[PDB]
């Protein structure tokens, strides 16, 4: 029982908004919906499409990175709000 110092929310929120500008450029924008002991839930959104083929790849990309940079999770619900692409 240390202290309720800048908890995860602060960090994630902090790093998120920081990387946001970069994510928007390539992927989109992330949004934390709920912080749990493992059953976290966020929402990705780059714009508004219908069948994103790139977001799917990126999705698994971030997830993997998160788990790797944060081993101990059990599940994560990342709901994307669509994000089509110019072409290819």
77's torsion region: left (phi>0), alpha (psi -120 to 50) or beta?
beta
Q: 26 to each of 11, 22, 71, how far by Cα in Å?
A: 22, 7, 25
CA distance 88 to 85: 7
Strands 39-45 and 29-34: antiparallel
78 touches 63 (CB < 8 A): yes
CA distance linking residue 19 with residue 22, whole number of Å = 5
**DSSP annotation of 6:** S
Contact 78, 42 (CB under 8 A): yes
Q: Alpha-carbon distance 14 to 19, whole Å?
A: 9
Q: Is residue 44 a contact partner of residue 28, using CB atoms and an 8 Å limit? A: yes
Our count of domains for the chain comes to: 1
Q: Identify the CATH number of the domain in which residue 13 sits.
A: 3.30.300.130
Q: Which two tokens stand for residue 22?
A: 């970069």
- Secondary structure class of 2 (helix, strand, coil): coil
Tokens of 51: 């069948």
Could you give the C-alpha distances from 67 to 35, 40, 85, in angstroms and in order? 15, 11, 27
Say which experimental method was used: NMR
Look up the domain containing 1 and give its range: 1-88
């Amino acid at each position: 029982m240390p202290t309720e110092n800048p908890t995860m929310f602060d960090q994630v929120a902090e790093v998120i908004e920081r990387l946001r500008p970069f994510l928007l450029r390539d992927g989109g924008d992330c949004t934390l919906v709920d912080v749990e002991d493992g059953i976290v839930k966020l929402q990705l959104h780059g714009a508004c499409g219908t069948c994103p083929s790139s977001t799917i790849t990126l999705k698994a990309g971030i997830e993997r990175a998160l788990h790797e940079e944060v081993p101990g999770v059990i599940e994560v619900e990342q709901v994307f709000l669509e994000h089509h692409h110019h072409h290819h």
